[PDB]
Design a protein around this ligand. Structure first.
Ligand SMILES: O=P(O)(O)OC[C@H]1O[C@@H]2OP(=O)(O)O[C@@H]2[C@@H]1O
Ligand SMILES: O=P(O)(O)OC[C@H]1O[C@@H]2OP(=O)(O)O[C@@H]2[C@@H]1O
Ligand SMILES: [Zn+2]
Ligand SMILES: [Zn+2]
Ligand SMILES: [Zn+2]
Ligand SMILES: [Zn+2]
Lengths: 143, 193, 278, 353, 353, 143, 278
């Protein structure tokens, strides 16, 4: 379940708005010494799609992808792959990924950094879904 | 000096068009065009209403000598812009009375096989729509048959009965008497009864 | 009333008059595609511009307008067109077929029989019934002029030889007044019989393709078929799930991902009448 | 049991509100002004004017803003707005020799009378994304030369005087107007050019490109491309003499094409013509190329590409029609599809019997 | 006598400065921001992303700003920028069933599981120019419904379960990549779809429209159009398990096409597929229509329209190539034209002898 | 030469920027009573172009055109046809056209309204021409 | 030097290596169009991308680059390409043919004979000499594979029968190494002889069409002609108005609207050398 947890928090960081993550990390005032293994680099992720949504693969263009990697003093490696071109955001995501692998930070960050971010994204999504569902065409109602 | 057109051009033109559409889609049915109260004499009310509804700069109008009057021409030009042509073959709308000759009738454009709509519409002013030789009309627009008796010229009756021009070619006939009119499209089978 | 800043029915008088002359010519030449100088509407080409222009050129203040799409008044495009006409004319509107003086439709003829003085205006994408056999107007025009309709008969016979049935299921070609092969618009074959000897005047507008044609009241309209493969209309094993009718064109509503579906009348006014009768 | 309910009107209203909100976008950002689009997105405006049929930069920018930058939707908006306006006049024929030049180039000669005037162009730029545009900047202070416009005769006039090309003569023929009468194939060159000017930029570009690749080759050289201000004049019935109503920014392209050797005259270059509103040129070039391609019946040319197929090209050129009809598939089609389904189910049952 | 002088570099610099000044426009107006273009001209951005090959809204808006709204120039700018970037990963195949829906409609059934979700659309709007946009306004306060997204299975899945259509099966074939190897005709469907996604919107729209008018008919119904956010995942070599790198706004179109009766299976509907970045749909619809048209060799179909001519369609679809080659005529061509002139003058002299 | 003079001043008014003309007319404080014969109306002028610039005519789209007409107390009729949609500008142009036909105003307005406007337009044109001519490609110079 | 933030010569190493393998294959197969996975450049397709990619894949720090268009270094596109290469490589550049190690050209071969170790890189719009006879690659590929060159010979013979001369005046097809019919790029017929048995290596890039081909040094290149209609180069009645040369390709400069013109060398470096000699 460790891999699933790492995937989940990396996902949450990858989907976070850079501004909110930066604000939340500044507020938590985490003191951690790290060195950048791989400087935040912006390149492309080639998008594979499927014929008919389910069939043979074909290349549906590319998207911008920024990747970063850091190492902590104890050797823990943090990584980040986020769509877009925000190098600072990628560095922050990699730092949080490294920290979340340390027993001293996993619980605290999960309660105060990751869960809050996921909840905010879910709230925004729910609001947008309500607005969109206003446009649903009603035809029949069961009596 | 010029004559007066519809008091309410939009609404009156729409009403007159709907009456004329009823007439053309149901041949032999008499309709009344009441929106215009005085025609541009010698043009009757129905003829003037049809011209005001349909005629414009895109539709040349030919008026036969008995119906060609300076005031009428000036009023037509002012109220519709419709170009006035002196030759029947150049007309989209042809206006005439009982004195229409066979030569003038045969000069009218009938359209072509590929462009049957490119012909002329003949507005003929008849003395009466009720006291002529009885005609039995069949075809599109008529459920079983319809009996009319307009007072028609011999040439017009020959054109209607014999149909020399092969369908889809042919002229569409609008008979006008005072404020009333009836329509016989090229499709109507006409038998002298 | 008209209180939107536009001319009544949104068309200038010149356009109305041109369209009216086209309508009269179409009536005099049943089934023949009359070209007309149609204009761009607030609706995109292919969303009913020809029907809109016809209705604008015929409609008056005392008309009761019914607009339907797929047989339903509440369809998105039907609502759009009807709201547009309410804005630019102010005419009374109805969902009841028997109270309508003008019926503008897309792909249905109402189950309720039409009556004298009613006009039904069809929205037509492809006014040329030979288009899918012969894509070029330069050829189909001549074929209509010379009554050279063999490619259509060959298409039908080849369809029978290949599949055992005529492949066309909607916009089924029809011979009008014994002469003109006409496209009845994308109505399903179910509706084609209603066109034969109908007391109402039928108008057909193809705005994008710039054609108007007409079937006058009480005109013969016969679907092309064979004696041993006679014209047959759509049938369903189920009645309407709402009103129980077995005589109406049905639309298939997919209810769940597990394959559960129901069938309900496409003609919503007819469905309401049937439901109120019972 | 199931009962029908009304949902169309409210769903439509909600959808339109959603689209308007998306068009506005983040309210923290200032709302775009039509003036800003007109000034700084001027090439999109040029395309919208040319294909919408109205040479009003402000209206084209308004349509673009309303269309959320969708050039097709904006073109349709302008084209539809055209229908609500009255034709107050018909201009006297434009005289492109009087154009006040922003740009004038010729590929057929190194140097020409009047010179190669590159004007404002993206030609010869290195297409490297300029990230400094992510923030406010300062436009370059333009250097200045002599203010006089040198005589710039049309290159085709210089070709024709040598006998290398044929002057385009005016016999007084009345132009066809496809806005008042639907096209009748085969169309006159006037109708074809009117339709090409209104045609989809991408479609015509692809057709011209195919002609360059051998599908109906016309051996084209860019004899002259001019972009500048041309005066518009009318003759009002009130006054009876010509009045200048202003000027329009227009681009004109004259292409030299494949020479021909007619039976009873010296061989000479053929030619194509393109004319558009604004500065965007490639529409004018493609229009000239496709105009030459559609000149095939005049020259008795055996067609080798779809660009020479008049009906195929012109019937599908107007993106108002094409976009409308392709989008109409989004409309409910379930009656039709039910008619198809019934047939298919019967066919399957018969095959499986 | 005449002496050559250097003018190329300074003329080019002046031309580029002129274009930059025109792009800035009237300095009294605030300079457009890339964020504003991204938010409020989002459909242009969608087109630029789809045809430029990079799904980065900010970069597409930057290209549009730099291109003065010229969609073709912006597409080329983004496409060129692609060349400077490294491929850091290849995504796992997209799974459109996981899309977070902004819009979902189906023309083949009145109502479907998940409902007709119109979302933000210009469909059913009356295209009347909204002059209130000439000044600042207030966006509508959106009404709200339940926030839950109902299950929205693909309509083609419901078709295939009935046996009316064929599931698109994955045999594991390696997709062709026309960005690394030039296309070889006849191309596989994967290559054809990759090229169609990059193709000119107008060209493909016109081709699809011609197919609707009988030039290679495919009897299309809009089986399903979805627009929404789809998650992108990769499998980095560093970690060896899948990571979600974010989500992209994409539109997917599945067209039901004319049924076929194969010798040894029940007759069934054919199908076409379209996929684009952003909300703009008509590109996806045209892509599906032309994809079905180019499926002709698979189905043994006798071609009746250029849309079925694979080489003609695909070789001229990319507007980067087409626009570049049509514009290249603006380049000096006086050496070749001189050769042409020499031949023509000799021909004229010989004929006149 | 009267018709040429009227054409010239109408041209100058038609090419003027609405703001400068409005400012200049406000400054001149001309007291003239007039009635609008034709309210400023915006429609279309259909543009006729020529094949090859010199040959057969064809319709190259339309442009917006605003027209206005006024009458002075003495019966003088002023007219204006200007590209665009500025109704107020069209009314001002028509008023100036009417005034310029009155002997009491022709000389004064010509010296203080028309000539100044033409000079300003010519100056703007000359400046733009200089900027554009910076982009001319030089190949040879006569020695 | 390279101080622009881009890799040397702007191409990533993978693209350079792919193009280099393509170049080697092209050299080993003279006249054959080698497909290659070309990339989009800062210049639009059709503005020299293939030549740019070739030069970027071959150029080194010690190379002296000459870029010409229409035979002139100062041409707009020549200036653009040369400035781009100066930005992304920093290499020395020259207008002198005899000092250039790499010559990238559009539509001219310099009058100054090339020498060993020089490479001349041609920009090619249409790499297929049969394209204007046969628009489809699916056919021209097979024709090259099977050496089925009859359509070209028929084109030439029909040209002679129609006009009395071969109609092609630039991009004149040439047989290379006795086997491959090759497009020499849109150089005038005047330049085709220079390609035969030349000490320099000739490379040809068509970026839009995605082809690279080559003519190694000292390879036979023979223009297709007939014995009684032998290959003839462009001629003019006037010498160069500047240097007086009668042996150079001339460009026609239109001086005034009254028909006054002059003729001057297209090869501006050759013209400068001739003017300095006198
Ligand atoms: O050309 P228009 O604008 O008059 O639209 C006519 C018809 O074309 C489309 O195809 P459809 O039959 O599905 O329905 C639409 C519309 O009703
Ligand atoms: O495809 P590319 O980008 O490599 O450009 C090759 C050639 O195509 C155009 O045609 P051209 O011979 O006139 O000159 C241009 C250019 O040099
Ligand atoms: Zn029911
Ligand atoms: Zn449809
Ligand atoms: Zn070229
Ligand atoms: Zn010289």
């Amino acid at each position: 379940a460790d891999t699933a947890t790492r995937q989940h928090w990396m996902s949450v960081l990858a989907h976070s708005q850079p501004a909110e993550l930066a604000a939340r990390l500044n507020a938590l005032n985490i003191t951690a010494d790290y060195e950048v293994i791989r400087a935040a680099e912006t390149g492309l992720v080639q998008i594979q799609a499927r014929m008919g949504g389910t069939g043979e693969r074909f290349f549906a263009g590319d998207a911008t992808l920024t990747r970063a990697a850091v190492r902590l003093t104890d050797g823990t490696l943090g990584y980040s792959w986020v769509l877009g071109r925000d190098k600072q955001h990628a560095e922050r995501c990699a730092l949080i990924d490294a920290l979340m692998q340390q027993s001293r930070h996993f619980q605290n960050l999960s309660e105060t950094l990751i869960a809050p971010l996921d909840a905010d994204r879910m709230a925004r999504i729910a609001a947008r879904q309500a607005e969109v569902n206003a446009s649903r065409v009603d035809f029949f109602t069961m009596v | 000096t010029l004559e007066t057109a519809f008091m309410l051009p939009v609404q009156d033109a729409q009403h007159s068009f709907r009456r004329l559409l009823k007439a053309m889609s149901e041949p032999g049915v008499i309709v009344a065009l009441h929106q215009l109260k005085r025609g541009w004499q010698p043009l009757n009310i129905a003829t003037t209403s049809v011209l005001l509804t349909l005629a414009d700069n895109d539709t040349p109008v030919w008026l036969s000598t008995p119906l060609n009057n300076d005031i009428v021409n000036q009023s037509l030009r002012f109220h519709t812009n419709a170009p006035l042509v002196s030759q029947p073959e150049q007309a989209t709308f042809a206006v005439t009375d009982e004195a229409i000759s066979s030569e003038q009738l045969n000069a009218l454009s009938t359209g072509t096989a590929v462009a049957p709509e490119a012909g002329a519409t003949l507005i003929l002013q008849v003395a009466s729509l009720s006291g002529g030789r009885m005609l039995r009309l069949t075809g599109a627009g008529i459920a079983e048959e319809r009996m009319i008796a307009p007072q028609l010229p011999e040439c017009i009756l020959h054109e209607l009965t014999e149909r020399p021009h092969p369908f889809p070619l042919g002229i569409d006939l609008i008979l006008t008497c005072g404020e009333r009119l009836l329509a016989i499209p090229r499709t109507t089978h006409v038998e002298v009864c | 009333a008209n209180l939107s800043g536009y001319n009544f029915a949104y068309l200038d008088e010149q356009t109305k008059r041109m369209i009216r002359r086209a309508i009269l010519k179409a009536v005099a030449i049943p089934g023949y595609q009359v070209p007309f100088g149609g204009r761009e509407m607030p609706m995109p080409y292919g969303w009913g511009t020809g029907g809109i222009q016809l209705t604008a050129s015929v409609i008056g203040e005392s008309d009761v307008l019914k607009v339907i799409d797929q047989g339903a008044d509440d369809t998105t495009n039907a609502v759009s067109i009807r709201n547009f006409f309410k804005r630019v004319t102010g005419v009374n509107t109805t969902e009841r077929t028997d109270d309508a003086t003008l019926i503008q439709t897309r792909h249905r003829i109402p189950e309720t029989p039409l009556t004298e003085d009613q006009i039904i205006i069809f929205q037509v994408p492809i006014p040329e019934p030979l288009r899918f056999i012969e894509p070029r107007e330069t050829e189909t025009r001549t074929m209509h002029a010379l009554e050279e309709y063999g490619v259509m008969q060959v298409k039908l016979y080849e369809d029978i030889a290949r599949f055992g049935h005529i492949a066309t299921t909607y916009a089924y070609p029809v011979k009008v007044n014994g002469r003109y092969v006409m496209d009845p618009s994308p109505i399903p074959k179910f509706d084609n019989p209603k066109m034969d000897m109908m007391p109402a005047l039928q108008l057909f507008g193809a705005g994008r393709e710039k054609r108007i044609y007409a079937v006058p009241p009480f005109t013969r309209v016969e679907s092309l078929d064979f004696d041993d493969h006679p014209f047959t209309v759509q049938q369903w094993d189920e009645p309407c799930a709402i009103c129980g009718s077995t005589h109406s064109y049905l639309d298939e509503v997919v209810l769940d991902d597990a394959g559960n579906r129901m069938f309900v009348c496409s003609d919503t006014d007819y469905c309401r009448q049937q439901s109120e009768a019972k | 049991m199931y009962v029908a309910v009304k949902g169309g009107e409210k769903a439509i209203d909600a959808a339109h509100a959603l689209q308007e909100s998306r068009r506005r976008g983040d309210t923290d950002l200032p709302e775009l002004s039509v003036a800003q689009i007109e000034q700084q997105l001027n090439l999109a405006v040029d395309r919208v004017m040319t294909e919408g049929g109205i040479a009003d930069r402000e209206l084209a920018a308004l349509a673009l803003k309303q269309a959320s930058g969708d050039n097709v939707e904006a073109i349709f908006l302008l084209r539809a707005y055209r229908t609500t306006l009255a034709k107050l006049a018909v201009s006297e024929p434009l005289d492109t020799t009087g154009m006040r030049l922003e740009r004038r180039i010729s590929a057929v000669y190194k140097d020409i009378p009047g010179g190669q005037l590159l004007g404002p162009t993206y030609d010869y730029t290195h297409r490297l994304l300029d990230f400094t545009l992510l923030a406010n900047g300062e436009a370059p202070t333009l250097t200045t030369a002599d203010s006089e416009q040198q005589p710039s005769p049309h290159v085709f006039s210089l070709l024709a005087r040598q006998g290398l090309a044929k002057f385009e003569e005016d016999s007084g023929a009345q132009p066809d107007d496809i806005t008042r009468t639907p096209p009748v194939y085969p169309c006159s060159r006037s109708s074809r050019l009117q339709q090409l000017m209104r045609g989809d930029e991408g479609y015509l570009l692809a057709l011209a490109y195919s002609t360059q690749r051998g599908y109906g080759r016309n051996h084209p050289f860019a004899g002259e491309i001019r972009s500048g201000y041309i005066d518009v004049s009318i003759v009002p019935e009130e006054l009876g003499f010509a009045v200048n109503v202003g000027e329009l920014l227009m681009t004109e392209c004259e292409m030299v094409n494949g020479f021909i050797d007619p039976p009873d005259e010296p061989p000479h270059f053929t030619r194509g013509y393109g004319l558009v509103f604004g500065m965007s040129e490639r529409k004018a070039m493609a229009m000239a190329l496709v105009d030459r391609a559609l000149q095939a019946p005049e020259y008795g040319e055996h067609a080798t590409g779809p660009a020479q197929d008049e009906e195929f090209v012109l019937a599908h050129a107007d993106n108002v029609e094409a976009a409308g009809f392709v989008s109409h598939l989004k409309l409910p089609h379930y009656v039709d599809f039910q008619a198809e389904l019934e047939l298919l189910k019967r066919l399957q049952q018969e095959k499986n019997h």
